Design a protein around this nucleic acid. Sequence first.
DNA 1: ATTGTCATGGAATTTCGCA
DNA 2: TGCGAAATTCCATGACA
DNA 3: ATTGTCATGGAATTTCGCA
DNA 4: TGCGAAATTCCATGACA
Lengths: 367, 367, 182, 182
Amino acid sequence: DAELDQLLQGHYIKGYPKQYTYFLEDGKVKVSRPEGVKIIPPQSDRQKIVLQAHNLAHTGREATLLKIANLYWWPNMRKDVVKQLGRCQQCLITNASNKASGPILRPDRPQKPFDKFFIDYIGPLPPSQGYLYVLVVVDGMTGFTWLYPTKAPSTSATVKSLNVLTSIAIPKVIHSDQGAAFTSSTFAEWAKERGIHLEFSTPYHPQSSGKVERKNSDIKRLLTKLLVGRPTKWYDLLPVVQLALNNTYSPVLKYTPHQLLFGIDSNTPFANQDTLDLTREEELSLLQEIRTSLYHPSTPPASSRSWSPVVGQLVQERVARPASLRPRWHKPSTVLKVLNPRTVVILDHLGNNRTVSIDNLKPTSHQ
Amino acid sequence: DAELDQLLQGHYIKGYPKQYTYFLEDGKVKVSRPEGVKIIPPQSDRQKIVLQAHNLAHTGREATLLKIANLYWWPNMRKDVVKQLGRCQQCLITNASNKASGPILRPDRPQKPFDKFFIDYIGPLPPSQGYLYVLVVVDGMTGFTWLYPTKAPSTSATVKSLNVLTSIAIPKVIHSDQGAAFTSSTFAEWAKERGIHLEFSTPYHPQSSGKVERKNSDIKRLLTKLLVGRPTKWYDLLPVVQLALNNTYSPVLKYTPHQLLFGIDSNTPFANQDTLDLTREEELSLLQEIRTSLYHPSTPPASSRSWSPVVGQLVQERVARPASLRPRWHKPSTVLKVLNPRTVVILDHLGNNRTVSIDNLKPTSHQ
Amino acid sequence: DRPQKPFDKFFIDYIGPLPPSQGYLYVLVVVDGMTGFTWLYPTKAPSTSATVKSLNVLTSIAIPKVIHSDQGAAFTSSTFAEWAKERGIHLEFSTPYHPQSSGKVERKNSDIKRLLTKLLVGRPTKWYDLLPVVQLALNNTYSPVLKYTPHQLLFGIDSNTPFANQDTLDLTREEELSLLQE
Amino acid sequence: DRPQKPFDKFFIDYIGPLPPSQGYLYVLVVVDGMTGFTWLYPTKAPSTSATVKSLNVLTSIAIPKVIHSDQGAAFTSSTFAEWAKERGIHLEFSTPYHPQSSGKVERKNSDIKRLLTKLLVGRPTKWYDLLPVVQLALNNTYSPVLKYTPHQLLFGIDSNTPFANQDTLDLTREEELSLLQE
DNA sequence: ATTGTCATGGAATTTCGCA
DNA sequence: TGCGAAATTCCATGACA
DNA sequence: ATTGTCATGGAATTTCGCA
DNA sequence: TGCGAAATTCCATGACA
Ligand SMILES: COC(=O)CCc1cnc2c(c1)c(N)c(C(=O)NCc1ccc(F)cc1F)c(=O)n2O
Ligand SMILES: COC(=O)CCc1cnc2c(c1)c(N)c(C(=O)NCc1ccc(F)cc1F)c(=O)n2O
Ligand SMILES: [Mg+2]
Ligand SMILES: [Mg+2]
Ligand SMILES: [Mg+2]
Ligand SMILES: [Mg+2]
Ligand SMILES: [Mg+2]
Ligand SMILES: [Mg+2]
Ligand SMILES: [Zn+2]
Ligand SMILES: [Zn+2]
């Protein structure tokens, strides 16, 4: 009231333009603006007014301002509006983001076979011979794939299948998503016993297992074609599918996963016979050169309105399996470290450290 | 064999370049090409060879050719390869499309209130007072919305609610998707009795009901915020939500759906008082001008590799709810008429006429 | 003075008791003072509860600045007063035994009583389903003073149900006899 | 003549019967002729069925041009002949009572018999679980003639499990005594 | 016989207050 | 006739099962 | 503590066969 | 040294729950 007092008599106050006539009427300070006559509420009333207008439908910046501007005017209204939007907990956890993630990374292809495995489960499928799932194991360098049918995506069925697989060779690293079969301690003890380092995707981000996820597509696609018109008996087709895909050419690479693994086709149809006159040593020499000259894609252009995380920034993690009529976003969190432009550690909503993908984050609006 | 006979002696045959030496060896016609020595199978064997190479993994153009080129060579191999790909039924119905749809249409806003209603159901939701669904009715011109809670998305519950709604005014047209409540004959008889024309979206294409679908989002979003921390008792909030959204400003329009319908706010918080001195007739005069000057968006740019349908073209309809390990596409169909660049009539896989959206079609590859 | 506008004043009143129709006995009449637009709500009693329950439906569409009614018990209760205060609605009562409103509203409430009577006869227990068509008729009836229907004054457009065939609103000789028997 | 290559020839043979381990009694040995790489499959009988069932697993990874074996009944059956013809595999038999192969394969099959015996003692019924580690040892064993391990000749890389500690492969005095008791 | 839509908040652009 | 700041407009983003 | 991927078929570009 | 056609490369599209 003290500020608005000097305004009525004609003194100047910073923020209130001088060329307007501020008068009193019905016990309220008013002003004649081009849009009409508006009420100038005292400073002590402005927070409550912004709150009442926002809470009508929990509207954003402009829809809240248009309501206030129907009755009131004061210097820098939107400033006070944005101030309330950043303090409304319901809006911060329910609204969607409008900033896209930064462009994807194209991590280096593993240098050698058996450097890194990507594993994942497909299923459930129609029951075939009592089996419901398929363990898919993809060698990251070659794309060579092993298929194992199981009755459940269990740790016990994974250990059984990988014991048979690693009869041929032990990998350095196995990469899996955070499914239950792979995150149990029994699976960790099984890997530690063999010098295998376990490497896990960020949660709820299948892109990170994209190498095996993409192979899952080819597997299902070929099973679909083979089962057209027939009942979905897929158990007896897994070896057929595994061999077919392992000998299929990648048009961009000009090689099949079998060729990248062994450097020479086996007794399969249309076997390439180009190296028939070389010795095995000359063949393996040509293989090491081919393995290091493979095409590798590059990070794409960022989109017009992308965000990249900064240490100390307020961000929010996407809710995993949100119930009906429940918010899709967690309470705000602080970024602790930036491992790469697409991966961060946050101080979790519970209080723990969590390594999450940027695709499951949004920057908290209004700072 | 007659064609390949003249080749061995040295005569010229169109398609076989002259500067290469074609010889015989092991009872097979061969040629010394830069990549190596390849077999030239007679014409009568080439179809079976393309088939055998394709069927290994049902690969496309280049992956099939690379297999054949390991052993054979003949003029225009890929021509014979594409010929088989267009005859492989399993590949045509299982593979994905790689041509995007043409850009979306932005149909004209209905000229008056009650010209066209958009209706749809939300749910099921958490049970509230025994209710599970919400009938959402959106007036296309104003965005004004009516909310009715029901126990099922039934025809009987729709007729009950619309009888209460149309106590205020009868619309010309009601637009709904092809859900069961709206496609029954009981609903058609109810509409014919009232001069209401029923207008249906193309099947499995919610974009076509986009006006009410978008309102569904605002409804759920506001219900979510209001129920934070509380049990999901949404029944008593529907009137609150309906009134709140009907009086919320659209920042791009600069008006609320209530204002577009009535031309004057009611006794709600922050009621706009700009027309207090005009008569009602002067107010309605300003309302008719506002209704015809509203912003309207335009069709966006087409993408790099979009397709648009042509009469007589072979296209394929997406399978509605495809089972596991089953094709995602129907057998090819013929385009009968092009109603607009985004809607066509096809001669269905069963034999009927079907009006479908282009987003649920792909052009059949290899003609 | 400011020109009269829709939602400036709602006139409410109860019609009944009527013959039972799907368990309802009364009709809560709401008429907008400026446009003459009419809403009809069926209730089971002339109580504050039924009144609040019915007006809660209407006020989720539009809220009037003032509600006007007679001194009926449902409207003069402290419960209804608290309901009106919560929504910022001012209550306005006519003097006991001296009902007043406006010429337009008086005549509209006359039409409603007469229109209901004409369709009561022959089917006195089927009026619950007829309330929708009754409102469409009342709201698309031409006003001799304003030279516009309530639908046009409220929405600023012509209606998709123009009731050109203006009904007689008087009881024929057969209906006169048949109504008398009850 | 063309240089010898992997998958040119697979040498197969049966080892058994062994003490029962998880219901299995035999081991089907498959050795690649060029690299010396070894696959071990446990079976329940030296039958064509068990042979086909086990080779069906191997031939979903790589298919040899030729399979070589002795004239054992499981390999000379018309069923196994039809199985080999369907996959384009040529069958090649050594003369009855005159087993032959190659020096590299002879010695590899010697190592396998000896390595199994050394781990049979003490735990004769637990060899089913040891087959994986047995293959890793055999396939990462250094070859004095080729100066490369089977793993290196097949994949062209070093292995993540280099068995530098070359085992004695001979029975210690205690194992000699304990094996004799059985 | 039919057809996407629009709240949201940073950024880009225009307008305002003053000289 | 031009400047700094506020006000307004622009528009990519994402969700309606 | 971690990170998208790659078959597909029209289109765009390069190479081939011949002079 | 240049043309028409074939061969090869390019790359947006979409699906891996
Ligand atoms: C036989 O036809 C049917 O069974 C149709 C059933 C049906 C009814 N209503 C639906 C849907 C399906 C349906 N899939 C959706 C649906 O998928 N909505 C999500 C959605 C996706 C994209 C979009 F642009 C808008 C949307 F609402 C829907 O919103 N409604 O109202
Ligand atoms: C506690 O963590 C969990 O419960 C994770 C469960 C789980 C496991 N495996 C999954 C998923 C979820 C899963 N959502 C997906 C999944 O959504 N895949 C679809 C998919 C989407 C995008 C993409 F780029 C690739 C994909 F495979 C999956 O592929 N796998 O293997
Ligand atoms: Mg998984
Ligand atoms: Mg997966
Ligand atoms: Mg629907
Ligand atoms: Mg919907
Ligand atoms: Mg009364
Ligand atoms: Mg033997
Ligand atoms: Zn809020
Ligand atoms: Zn095919």
